[PDB]
Enzyme design. Sequence first.
Site, PDB file in Angstrom:
ATOM      1  N   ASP A 103       0.907  -1.177   0.079  1.00 26.00           N
ATOM      2  CA  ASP A 103       0.138   0.023  -0.045  1.00 26.00           C
ATOM      3  C   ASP A 103       0.935   1.333  -0.010  1.00 26.00           C
ATOM      4  OD1 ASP A 103      -0.890  -2.531   1.554  1.00 26.00           O
ATOM      5  OD2 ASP A 103      -2.957  -1.279   1.154  1.00 26.00           O
TER       6      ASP A 103
ATOM      7  N   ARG B 272       2.460   1.759  -3.346  1.00 29.78           N
ATOM      8  CA  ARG B 272       1.299   2.541  -4.328  1.00 29.78           C
ATOM      9  C   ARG B 272       1.112   4.045  -3.980  1.00 29.78           C
ATOM     10  NH1 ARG B 272      -2.123  -2.714  -3.331  1.00 29.78           N
ATOM     11  NH2 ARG B 272      -1.894  -3.771  -5.615  1.00 29.78           N
TER      12      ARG B 272
ATOM     13  N   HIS C  41      -4.131  -3.675   5.768  1.00 27.63           N
ATOM     14  CA  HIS C  41      -3.827  -3.667   4.366  1.00 27.63           C
ATOM     15  C   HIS C  41      -5.262  -3.342   3.975  1.00 27.63           C
ATOM     16  CE1 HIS C  41      -2.744  -4.947   0.585  1.00 27.63           C
ATOM     17  NE2 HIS C  41      -3.446  -5.908   0.610  1.00 27.63           N
TER      18      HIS C  41
HETATM   19  N1  LIG Z   1      -0.756  -8.771   1.187  1.00 27.87           N
HETATM   20  C1  LIG Z   1      -0.901  -8.192   0.095  1.00 27.87           C
HETATM   21  O1  LIG Z   1      -0.340  -6.968  -0.143  1.00 27.87           O
HETATM   22  C2  LIG Z   1      -1.212  -8.875  -1.335  1.00 27.87           C
HETATM   23  C3  LIG Z   1      -1.348 -10.374  -0.890  1.00 27.87           C
HETATM   24  N2  LIG Z   1      -2.249 -11.198  -1.917  1.00 27.87           N
HETATM   25  C4  LIG Z   1      -2.580 -12.520  -1.444  1.00 27.87           C
HETATM   26  O2  LIG Z   1      -1.479 -13.812  -2.082  1.00 27.87           O
HETATM   27  C5  LIG Z   1      -2.456 -14.774  -1.949  1.00 27.87           C
HETATM   28  C6  LIG Z   1      -2.060 -15.588  -3.155  1.00 27.87           C
HETATM   29  O3  LIG Z   1      -2.307 -14.836  -4.045  1.00 27.87           O
HETATM   30  P1  LIG Z   1      -2.574 -15.762  -5.615  1.00 27.87           P
HETATM   31  O4  LIG Z   1      -1.453 -16.082  -6.217  1.00 27.87           O
HETATM   32  O5  LIG Z   1      -3.218 -14.511  -6.697  1.00 27.87           O
HETATM   33  O6  LIG Z   1      -3.860 -16.815  -5.343  1.00 27.87           O
HETATM   34  P2  LIG Z   1      -3.791 -18.267  -6.179  1.00 27.87           P
HETATM   35  O7  LIG Z   1      -5.033 -19.004  -5.816  1.00 27.87           O
HETATM   36  O8  LIG Z   1      -3.802 -18.288  -7.657  1.00 27.87           O
HETATM   37  O9  LIG Z   1      -2.488 -19.246  -5.470  1.00 27.87           O
HETATM   38  C7  LIG Z   1      -2.826 -19.816  -4.045  1.00 27.87           C
HETATM   39  C8  LIG Z   1      -1.931 -20.923  -4.377  1.00 27.87           C
HETATM   40  O10 LIG Z   1      -1.788 -21.697  -2.861  1.00 27.87           O
HETATM   41  C9  LIG Z   1      -1.966 -23.183  -3.000  1.00 27.87           C
HETATM   42  N3  LIG Z   1      -2.607 -23.732  -2.051  1.00 27.87           N
HETATM   43  C10 LIG Z   1      -4.020 -23.917  -1.200  1.00 27.87           C
HETATM   44  N4  LIG Z   1      -3.870 -24.788  -0.328  1.00 27.87           N
HETATM   45  C11 LIG Z   1      -2.414 -24.923  -0.218  1.00 27.87           C
HETATM   46  C12 LIG Z   1      -1.712 -25.330   1.008  1.00 27.87           C
HETATM   47  N5  LIG Z   1      -1.905 -26.181   2.456  1.00 27.87           N
HETATM   48  N6  LIG Z   1      -0.552 -25.522   1.041  1.00 27.87           N
HETATM   49  C13 LIG Z   1       0.229 -25.151  -0.293  1.00 27.87           C
HETATM   50  N7  LIG Z   1      -0.563 -24.501  -0.985  1.00 27.87           N
HETATM   51  C14 LIG Z   1      -1.804 -24.388  -0.981  1.00 27.87           C
HETATM   52  C15 LIG Z   1      -2.827 -23.229  -4.112  1.00 27.87           C
HETATM   53  O11 LIG Z   1      -2.651 -24.376  -4.986  1.00 27.87           O
HETATM   54  C16 LIG Z   1      -2.416 -22.024  -4.919  1.00 27.87           C
HETATM   55  O12 LIG Z   1      -1.501 -22.306  -6.288  1.00 27.87           O
HETATM   56  C17 LIG Z   1      -3.810 -14.424  -1.867  1.00 27.87           C
HETATM   57  O13 LIG Z   1      -4.260 -14.801  -0.537  1.00 27.87           O
HETATM   58  C18 LIG Z   1      -3.597 -12.905  -2.084  1.00 27.87           C
HETATM   59  O14 LIG Z   1      -5.011 -12.200  -1.570  1.00 27.87           O
HETATM   60  C19 LIG Z   1      -2.247 -10.951  -3.170  1.00 27.87           C
HETATM   61  C20 LIG Z   1      -1.545  -9.486  -3.772  1.00 27.87           C
HETATM   62  C21 LIG Z   1      -1.253  -8.477  -2.602  1.00 27.87           C
HETATM   63  C1  LIG Z   2     -15.540 -11.092   8.664  1.00 27.78           C
HETATM   64  C2  LIG Z   2     -14.549 -10.551   7.540  1.00 27.78           C
HETATM   65  C3  LIG Z   2     -13.791  -9.741   7.410  1.00 27.78           C
HETATM   66  C4  LIG Z   2     -12.691  -9.386   6.329  1.00 27.78           C
HETATM   67  C5  LIG Z   2     -12.790 -10.649   5.565  1.00 27.78           C
HETATM   68  C6  LIG Z   2     -12.032 -10.983   4.497  1.00 27.78           C
HETATM   69  C7  LIG Z   2     -11.365 -11.173   3.497  1.00 27.78           C
HETATM   70  C8  LIG Z   2     -10.579 -11.246   2.454  1.00 27.78           C
HETATM   71  C9  LIG Z   2     -10.448 -12.542   1.762  1.00 27.78           C
HETATM   72  C10 LIG Z   2      -9.642 -12.784   0.780  1.00 27.78           C
HETATM   73  C11 LIG Z   2      -9.024 -11.651   0.100  1.00 27.78           C
HETATM   74  C12 LIG Z   2      -9.095 -10.579   0.807  1.00 27.78           C
HETATM   75  C13 LIG Z   2      -8.232  -9.273   0.256  1.00 27.78           C
HETATM   76  N1  LIG Z   2      -7.455  -9.206  -0.762  1.00 27.78           N
HETATM   77  N2  LIG Z   2      -6.917  -8.108  -0.940  1.00 27.78           N
HETATM   78  C14 LIG Z   2      -5.775  -7.759  -1.855  1.00 27.78           C
HETATM   79  N3  LIG Z   2      -5.031  -7.139  -2.074  1.00 27.78           N
HETATM   80  C15 LIG Z   2      -4.343  -7.176  -3.252  1.00 27.78           C
HETATM   81  C16 LIG Z   2      -3.122  -6.091  -3.371  1.00 27.78           C
HETATM   82  O1  LIG Z   2      -2.762  -6.135  -4.427  1.00 27.78           O
HETATM   83  O2  LIG Z   2      -3.061  -5.281  -2.389  1.00 27.78           O
HETATM   84  C17 LIG Z   2      -4.774  -8.104  -3.857  1.00 27.78           C
HETATM   85  S1  LIG Z   2      -6.028  -9.394  -3.290  1.00 27.78           S
HETATM   86  C18 LIG Z   2      -7.464  -7.260   0.019  1.00 27.78           C
HETATM   87  C19 LIG Z   2      -7.068  -5.574  -0.028  1.00 27.78           C
HETATM   88  C20 LIG Z   2      -8.015  -4.856  -1.156  1.00 27.78           C
HETATM   89  C21 LIG Z   2      -7.520  -5.093  -2.462  1.00 27.78           C
HETATM   90  C22 LIG Z   2      -7.371  -3.957  -1.798  1.00 27.78           C
HETATM   91  C23 LIG Z   2      -8.414  -7.916   0.758  1.00 27.78           C
HETATM   92  C24 LIG Z   2      -9.124  -7.247   1.850  1.00 27.78           C
HETATM   93  C25 LIG Z   2      -8.548  -7.282   3.000  1.00 27.78           C
HETATM   94  C26 LIG Z   2      -9.715  -7.431   4.019  1.00 27.78           C
HETATM   95  C27 LIG Z   2      -9.450  -7.521   5.348  1.00 27.78           C
HETATM   96  C28 LIG Z   2      -7.999  -7.319   5.833  1.00 27.78           C
HETATM   97  S2  LIG Z   2      -7.596  -7.653   7.592  1.00 27.78           S
HETATM   98  N4  LIG Z   2      -6.850  -6.114   7.923  1.00 27.78           N
HETATM   99  O3  LIG Z   2      -8.561  -8.009   8.338  1.00 27.78           O
HETATM  100  O4  LIG Z   2      -6.312  -8.551   7.664  1.00 27.78           O
HETATM  101  C29 LIG Z   2      -7.031  -7.454   4.681  1.00 27.78           C
HETATM  102  F1  LIG Z   2      -5.787  -7.429   4.950  1.00 27.78           F
HETATM  103  C30 LIG Z   2      -7.400  -7.302   3.495  1.00 27.78           C
HETATM  104  C31 LIG Z   2      -9.985 -10.443   1.930  1.00 27.78           C
HETATM  105  S3  LIG Z   2     -14.013 -11.603   6.339  1.00 27.78           S
END
Ligand SMILES: NC(=O)C1=CN([C@@H]2O[C@H](COP(=O)(O)OP(=O)(O)OC[C@H]3O[C@@H](n4cnc5c(N)ncnc54)[C@H](O)[C@@H]3O)[C@@H](O)[C@H]2O)C=CC1
Ligand SMILES: Cc1ccc(C#Cc2cccc(-c3nn(-c4nc(C(=O)O)cs4)c(CC4CC4)c3Cc3ccc(S(N)(=O)=O)c(F)c3)c2)s1
Lengths: 331, 331, 331, 331
Positions: free
Chosen positions: B165, B168, B192
């Site tokens: 964040d 960005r 986030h």
């Molecule tokens: N914190 C941030 O700033 C951001 C975080 N994310 C999060 O990253 C995570 C992954 O994003 P994506 O790659 O786009 O989703 P995705 O669904 O394509 O990748 C998830 C992978 O985890 C695997 N998976 C499910 N259970 C598993 C287990 N026990 N053990 C090992 N692998 C397992 C799945 O097979 C999958 O390949 C998402 O939760 C996303 O919201 C995405 C962008 C920004």
């Molecule tokens: C009772 C309940 C409350 C909330 C629930 C929930 C939930 C959930 C489940 C799957 C995916 C997300 C989620 N993914 N996501 C991404 N971001 C990016 C990036 O490129 O930035 C790519 S996907 C974001 C941020 C948004 C795009 C900008 C969220 C929202 C979120 C919500 C809550 C917390 S928090 N503070 O409670 O941890 C977070 F950290 C983020 C959320 S269920």
Amino acid sequence: ATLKDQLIYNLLKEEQTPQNKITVVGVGAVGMACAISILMKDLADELALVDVIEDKLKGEMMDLQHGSLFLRTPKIVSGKDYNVTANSKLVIITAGARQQEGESRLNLVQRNVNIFKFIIPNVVKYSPNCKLLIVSNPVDILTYVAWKISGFPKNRVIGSGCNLDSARFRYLMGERLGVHPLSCHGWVLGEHGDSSVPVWSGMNVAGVSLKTLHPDLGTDKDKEQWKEVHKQVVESAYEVIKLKGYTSWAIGLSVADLAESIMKNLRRVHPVSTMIKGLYGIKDDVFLSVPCILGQNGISDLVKVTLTSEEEARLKKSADTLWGIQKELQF
Amino acid sequence: ATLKDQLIYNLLKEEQTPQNKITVVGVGAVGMACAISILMKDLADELALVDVIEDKLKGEMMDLQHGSLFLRTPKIVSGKDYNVTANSKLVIITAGARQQEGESRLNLVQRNVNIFKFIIPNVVKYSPNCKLLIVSNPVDILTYVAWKISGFPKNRVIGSGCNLDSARFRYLMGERLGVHPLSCHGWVLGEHGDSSVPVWSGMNVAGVSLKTLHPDLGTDKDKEQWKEVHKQVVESAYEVIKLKGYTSWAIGLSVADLAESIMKNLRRVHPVSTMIKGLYGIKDDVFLSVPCILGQNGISDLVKVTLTSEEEARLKKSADTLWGIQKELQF
Amino acid sequence: ATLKDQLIYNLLKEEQTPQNKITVVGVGAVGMACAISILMKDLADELALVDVIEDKLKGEMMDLQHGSLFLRTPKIVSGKDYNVTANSKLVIITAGARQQEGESRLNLVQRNVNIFKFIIPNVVKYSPNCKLLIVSNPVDILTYVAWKISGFPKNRVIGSGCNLDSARFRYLMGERLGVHPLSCHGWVLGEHGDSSVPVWSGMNVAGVSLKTLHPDLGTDKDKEQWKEVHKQVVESAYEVIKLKGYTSWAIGLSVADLAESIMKNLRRVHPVSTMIKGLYGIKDDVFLSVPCILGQNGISDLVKVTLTSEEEARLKKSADTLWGIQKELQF
Amino acid sequence: ATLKDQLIYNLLKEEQTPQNKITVVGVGAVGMACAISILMKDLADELALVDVIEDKLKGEMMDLQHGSLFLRTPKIVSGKDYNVTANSKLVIITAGARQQEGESRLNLVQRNVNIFKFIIPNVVKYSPNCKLLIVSNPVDILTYVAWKISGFPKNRVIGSGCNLDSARFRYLMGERLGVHPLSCHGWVLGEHGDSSVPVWSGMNVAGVSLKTLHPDLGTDKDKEQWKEVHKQVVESAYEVIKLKGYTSWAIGLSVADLAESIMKNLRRVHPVSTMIKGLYGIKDDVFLSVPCILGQNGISDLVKVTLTSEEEARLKKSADTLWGIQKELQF
Ligand SMILES: NC(=O)C1=CN([C@@H]2O[C@H](COP(=O)(O)OP(=O)(O)OC[C@H]3O[C@@H](n4cnc5c(N)ncnc54)[C@H](O)[C@@H]3O)[C@@H](O)[C@H]2O)C=CC1
Ligand SMILES: Cc1ccc(C#Cc2cccc(-c3nn(-c4nc(C(=O)O)cs4)c(CC4CC4)c3Cc3ccc(S(N)(=O)=O)c(F)c3)c2)s1
Ligand SMILES: NC(=O)C1=CN([C@@H]2O[C@H](COP(=O)(O)OP(=O)(O)OC[C@H]3O[C@@H](n4cnc5c(N)ncnc54)[C@H](O)[C@@H]3O)[C@@H](O)[C@H]2O)C=CC1
Ligand SMILES: NC(=O)C1=CN([C@@H]2O[C@H](COP(=O)(O)OP(=O)(O)OC[C@H]3O[C@@H](n4cnc5c(N)ncnc54)[C@H](O)[C@@H]3O)[C@@H](O)[C@H]2O)C=CC1
Ligand SMILES: NC(=O)C1=CN([C@@H]2O[C@H](COP(=O)(O)OP(=O)(O)OC[C@H]3O[C@@H](n4cnc5c(N)ncnc54)[C@H](O)[C@@H]3O)[C@@H](O)[C@H]2O)C=CC1
Ligand SMILES: Cc1ccc(C#Cc2cccc(-c3nn(-c4nc(C(=O)O)cs4)c(CC4CC4)c3Cc3ccc(S(N)(=O)=O)c(F)c3)c2)s1
Ligand SMILES: Cc1ccc(C#Cc2cccc(-c3nn(-c4nc(C(=O)O)cs4)c(CC4CC4)c3Cc3ccc(S(N)(=O)=O)c(F)c3)c2)s1
Ligand SMILES: Cc1ccc(C#Cc2cccc(-c3nn(-c4nc(C(=O)O)cs4)c(CC4CC4)c3Cc3ccc(S(N)(=O)=O)c(F)c3)c2)s1
């Protein structure tokens, strides 16, 4: 005054002309792998992306821009209009059609040709002096197609060719010997993929010829089955395609390696596909991989590898087959 | 003798122990972007990949291996079994479920919690001293989950949090000012995504406070609507998700940046999610992003940002909301 | 409270233990060129410097520290006492005496031997598991000396040897051919400097043997006098010494290249000096340069280059000469 | 045919025109530190060196060339004739006279001016469009001298100024706080060295103003004596000069950082010395350090830092003193 003007005093109305600009056309997995690899190697001061899928293009551009803090490429642009590509030094073509279920490779060839007939004229219009690096498959045919449509002299049209095949060869050779591929030398030449030619005479570590140590190397009598190393250069690509659906990371890194030699005028030698008429008895306009010296003018020179009669005949057969297909393509 | 033994004399057959190993769990788009960014920054001498989809996992590993010639990370491994992750210094969790049609978000989170209940004990078993970097969303909740399940001290459990964040924010700030984001300073803290908190008092170039130059900065009275910079920090992520389906490149670059500070012990300051009870007025066990000093021990220290009454109330409200959700999750 | 404690909350006050530490002993031109090259390649998280000239040592350390903003090696230390070197993974010896007027070379070597008798036990005391990289001249003799005094296994004592000679060979070969040295392959083996052995049979571009193309390569019958390439490998070092007083930049870069293979466990092949008894027909305890595979355990393997009768006789003669000198040195 | 022509087939008679060329003038310790830092950051495709000491110049050039294998800058040239500098993008002046025993700094000023009267016209003759980066001391006076002799508009004449002073400030601030200088922000402005001005109002970590946390910061009432941090910015430079004879590594890295912003059009903000007439009541042609935006056109913009009355008066006093000296210089 605005906050910007309160904070910042302007000295120059800048002309904003790109000095080390690269364009990638086609932002599928391969194009974006090329893009990230180029970005993380600091090869360009401006990166332009082009595609026909407008939402996908804008999303990929924005994703890269959000990482700008972690990069040193200050301008990332995109568009379907080629004015965003103006004055590129290097233009990388990774565009292609999607093979439909039950559609043969032969049908893809003309669809990719039709894509190139739209792309290449627009590239030339806005970057008449660029180098063209063709990655789309079938890569040797499409490099010829790009050369013909662009009108460019042959030094400025480069096919990815056997650069990745040779990297795979050296990885697999390295795994057999327990040595890093950077120190395992060996060349795969000719056509990309199935019909490529392993030049066993050049396989060496520290200048020690494997073929001289082991005269059966690469033959059917070889008890160690080193021919299987080249078989796996081909088969491992099909395997990755089967396992994950496509390949992307290896080609992206290999493309960034070629871009590095071109942008930095390094004059390193790479096995890339080049217009090879006049060599090996080849008398037709075809593109095949040989070791080429790459720099800021594209392919300035090439190495004449000493080939056995059998190796020369395989390259000539590729040339004949490529000309046979190319004469049936509609431009 | 074999060709290898004819060519190479072995001095020691030793049991290679990894010195700078990183594991990425989950080879989706996010995990692989992390993988490629880590590879191209030379942060590890060994990279391990883990997922439950076996063919995809092997295909991605092999694709990276075919690029070894262009890398300086000599060992890339993968497997569904966690013995491939042994002795990692840093373990990056990007695993998650995909929301099913008509499934509530709370149930989706519980499915992700269940995924962590499988992953985290197996990570601890083979790398009890690692640092845990949690990327999966909802990231602040799942970082708490990882912390609770692992038993780790809080310095070794880090959530990506608002690192992206803030990146960005600085990209958007740079675009408004015509200055590289490296020179545009500004901090997004707390949760986030949607509930993040832009700290207007820290926004500056060359130590010049924008808020002092422009006291309406970030308020509704602001004729220049600098509040839209923070609104776009939130909206642009949703926009990228809409345009290309997901985000990957920027998060990959930001994760490699955190990995760089940890692996090289830089003691740089990053906005990452940490267990903040006792600081910033929070009285519950929750994870929120504050500026943390990152090094070989994880989070060794954190910066106590001076907050306004509104900013402090927003963080406390985030903590109340996070705590309410966590007690509704089943461990 | 102090300003630091007002600003920063401390989670752990821990006893920082170095993870990727390199020591350079001797901060002359050669040692500092090694230092700067290592710093700019991000090979260490801690750099320690040692010398006997206390003011110079502190001035060089501080100069490097003033550049910390531009580096990613967070800790740079120095001292005359070897406790600053504790737990180094790699220790680089560039220490040496300066020849006095009318002093014989044999006495100069003995003074350098005496220097090593002071340095090497103190290095072992504080880093018993390190790899030793010996740069001081005469390098092959002093690498033996370091090996004898340290008690280390031979894999962990490496002499710079002909790594630099080979780099000069490939630069000169590249200049003749108009090809980057990265693509010009050729090996200089045996003793560093005047008695080095150019292995004409390994000289190649893209696996094409120059000797096979040009059978007179390196002989007196050679109309193109390729033997002058090896003559200039020797003469150009003396020329640089005459023109600027010493050499430093090229040796610094070549030492950082070896350090890169060791610190990242690359298993690349380098021409470095190793204890060669039992191989290449040598029957005495001497160090000569052969192609060695370098990694986190030092020299794990070496390449057995196929030599002509003349090349083998030259290496055996070098070994006889080295053994005669070593028994005339006092340990 | 020659061996070269047997091995290599030539496609193009190349025009050999440099695209990203940098020149360093003066190959003392400072010039060679700039040179190595630029080489190891891949900022140029051609490096030219100029000096009047012909043997030293050729020796340093050869030393660098012998390391070409380990670099990606394919052409390194040198000469006393400025035709070797033609078409440079960036020309770095590190030339100066040697202070004689018992010679005052005042005597050096005119000797360095006399050196600049020979150098600068020859630079313009062969690179009329370059950016000039002045490092020689007294740097603010000599940047003015270079600007006047070159005829360049003020965006293309840049003085190293307080870039290194600010790096030293951030290193020392980092040591007090236990934070990497990359995350410790603070600006030293005005004249390089003794008369530089620490802008206490901008000193911050993560956007948290130290001055607001600690209102006595930098004053005489400060129990923590933070003014000593700026005193050491000045004193530590004199200390390194006393301990090792000169400074080189820190300035070389700082110069390469500025070159990076210029060559890569990054538009980062640096405290460099710029023609400041029209600001702070300054009505004379003088060069002082303020935060400047650096890119491919040099200084395109500058940040107007809000200064206290005292800070503004110190900058004005520097401007008056500089004009007083400059009007007595002979051109
Ligand atoms: N914190 C941030 O700033 C951001 C975080 N994310 C999060 O990253 C995570 C992954 O994003 P994506 O790659 O786009 O989703 P995705 O669904 O394509 O990748 C998830 C992978 O985890 C695997 N998976 C499910 N259970 C598993 C287990 N026990 N053990 C090992 N692998 C397992 C799945 O097979 C999958 O390949 C998402 O939760 C996303 O919201 C995405 C962008 C920004
Ligand atoms: C009772 C309940 C409350 C909330 C629930 C929930 C939930 C959930 C489940 C799957 C995916 C997300 C989620 N993914 N996501 C991404 N971001 C990016 C990036 O490129 O930035 C790519 S996907 C974001 C941020 C948004 C795009 C900008 C969220 C929202 C979120 C919500 C809550 C917390 S928090 N503070 O409670 O941890 C977070 F950290 C983020 C959320 S269920
Ligand atoms: N030469 C080599 O070594 C290898 C080459 N490739 C080839 O790269 C090409 C692309 O691979 P992928 O990214 O996986 O395929 P992809 O189908 O995912 O991406 C191709 C992109 O081209 C775009 N496209 C179609 N027409 C276009 C047009 N007129 N203009 C601009 N863009 C257009 C498409 O929208 C698509 O986004 C394929 O042909 C592939 O075979 C793949 C790896 C190795
Ligand atoms: N192997 C190769 O390819 C090359 C090796 N070298 C060798 O590197 C060595 C250093 O070269 P230079 O820096 O030019 O010489 P130098 O004389 O300037 O540096 C030697 C430093 O060692 C210090 N010294 C002496 N005794 C010491 C002791 N017990 N402990 C610690 N330091 C001690 C000295 O104070 C001096 O600072 C030389 O022996 C040189 O021949 C030089 C270039 C190429
Ligand atoms: N702006 C900053 O932050 C600092 C600047 N400096 C300054 O850099 C300058 C050079 O420093 P050093 O290398 O230690 O001094 P140095 O005396 O060792 O090298 C100066 C070189 O300039 C050459 N020279 C003299 N006249 C020349 C002419 N017409 N044309 C070409 N070259 C000529 C000299 O032969 C010499 O090789 C000094 O003025 C120093 O004060 C030093 C470090 C920090
Ligand atoms: C009458 C006709 C002639 C040619 C036709 C055709 C065709 C076609 C259409 C789509 C994709 C391909 C193709 N893609 N592809 C990839 N490789 C990689 C990698 O990662 O390596 C990733 S996908 C490969 C190589 C294989 C995986 C190892 C091919 C095969 C091919 C065949 C022919 C030429 S050539 N010399 O004729 O140009 C090529 F260069 C390559 C081919 S129909
Ligand atoms: C009874 C005796 C026999 C030999 C004695 C001896 C001796 C001595 C003492 C100080 C310095 C040297 C020396 N330095 N030096 C440099 N090289 C470089 C570079 O930039 O390359 C920079 S200085 C070279 C190489 C030459 C410039 C090209 C030598 C010569 C040498 C001689 C012998 C061995 S050896 N095989 O016996 O170890 C070596 F390795 C090197 C030598 S006393
Ligand atoms: C009537 C007159 C006016 C000026 C005269 C003069 C003069 C002179 C002559 C040779 C060397 C210097 C000088 N070099 N040097 C170095 N610094 C470093 C580093 O590593 O930092 C390495 S050497 C410094 C800075 C100091 C170490 C910390 C100075 C002092 C200075 C003085 C004046 C201006 S200025 N604003 O007037 O141009 C400057 F910029 C710098 C100065 S005689």
